[PDB]
Structure 1
Amino acid sequence: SGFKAERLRVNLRLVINRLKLLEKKKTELAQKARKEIADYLAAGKDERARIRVEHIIREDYLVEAMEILELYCDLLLARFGLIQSMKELDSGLAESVSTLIWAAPRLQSEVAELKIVADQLCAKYSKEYGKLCRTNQIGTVNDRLMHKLSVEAPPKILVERYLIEIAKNYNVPYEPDSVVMAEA
């Protein structure tokens, strides 16, 4: 198998600590980035402000995804007894285990330990289950997290709404795209 329970336990703790730092850091970098949007709006460079807002939306979704994975790591730590007890997958862990396996190849650039967590879960359960997770053929990965780590561009109505609210907060004039706002 190659499964070592203390590898899984140690790395789940490391993943939580690293995600808790990245949430904080990426939240602060969004504060700095929203002022940059106001600067483009003040300069009347609205078409670039739209594209810079897509960066902020993606990092905001990412932070919300990190909060979900930090919760599923802490759930596996809370019910770690069941992992090392049974050989079958408990139904209460199914969402958590499948999601962490699905997320790992997306997040492994930033959270190196999450690669190791997924490896260990794919050792404890079958390599086959480990494949059904990565494709969500298993039909168990958390939908709300899959949405937040999608590669698609934001809805253009969201981009406009972001600009409107940033414009308000920094007291900068902005007029949204009527062609987009008609789709509301």
Structure 2
Amino acid sequence: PSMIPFTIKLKTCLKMCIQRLRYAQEKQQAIAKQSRRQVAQLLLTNKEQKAHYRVETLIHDDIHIELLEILELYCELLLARVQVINDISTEEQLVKEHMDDGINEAIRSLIYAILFVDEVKELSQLKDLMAWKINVEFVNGVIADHIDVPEKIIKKCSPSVPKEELVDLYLKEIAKTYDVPYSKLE
């Protein structure tokens, strides 16, 4: 395992993140759905306050999920374009040449997400496999100055406090699905 084909190490590495990224999805989706259930439970107990703040969490967890489906995709995208990834060695290349196919918008973000998503430890492997293809400077140029990192990404990683409106709107919806009678403060 010394002089083995890049194209291979990368294909297996990505394939991994996918497998785990989806696992996190299935698990957190089911987990979040059971939280919704409990949210309704708190309504049927006049615990208005404890049902409010609780939902705020429901949002951040739901937003996290989104960030996963998005990272999933970004990988799959790269996995296919593996052949095209092997023909790169400088930043200039990826930057102003593979921006239409989304190769850049995908790899750059994934590396950023490393710190923020710890349920897919294997992601870090990609950062390392970048110096293997480019350098150790590229990675630091992302984790630090998120150069060309999608807006929706950086934002779903550290989601801003939930808007009062969205919360109330959420509660009202959880009620129209489980029961409850009075959703006050709307």
TM (norm. structure 1) is: 0.86
1:125 aligns with 2:134: yes
CA distance in 2, matches of 1:157, 1:125: 46
Runs of 4+ in structure 1 off by over 4 angstroms are none
Range with greater deviation from structure 2 (17-26 or 118-127):
118-127
Q: Cα 1:97–1:4, aligned 2, differ >3 Å: closer, same or farther? A: farther
Backbone CA RMSD of aligned residues: 1.9
8 Å CA contact 1:164, 1:174 repeated in 2 = no
Aligned with 1:85: secondary structure?
coil
1:134 aligns with 2:143: yes
State the AA in 1 paired with 2:112: W
Give the superposition deviation at 1:176. Answer: 3.8
Runs of 5+ unmatched residues, structure 1: 179-184
Q: Equivalent residues in 2 for 1:7-156 (5 A)?
A: 7-88=9-90, 89-90=93-94, 91-92=98-99, 93-107=103-117, 109-138=118-147, 140-156=148-164
CA distance in 2, matches of 1:12, 1:69: 11
State the AA in 2 paired with 1:41: L
Give the superposition deviation at 1:112. Answer: 0.9
CA distance in 1, matches of 2:84, 2:136: 20
Identity of aligned residues (%): 34
CA distance in 2, matches of 1:149, 1:29: 19
CA distance in 1, matches of 2:79, 2:185: 48
TM (norm. structure 2) is: 0.85
CA distance in 1, matches of 2:32, 2:114: 24
Aligned with 1:87: secondary structure?
coil
CA distance in 1, matches of 2:135, 2:108: 12
State the AA in 1 paired with 2:162: P
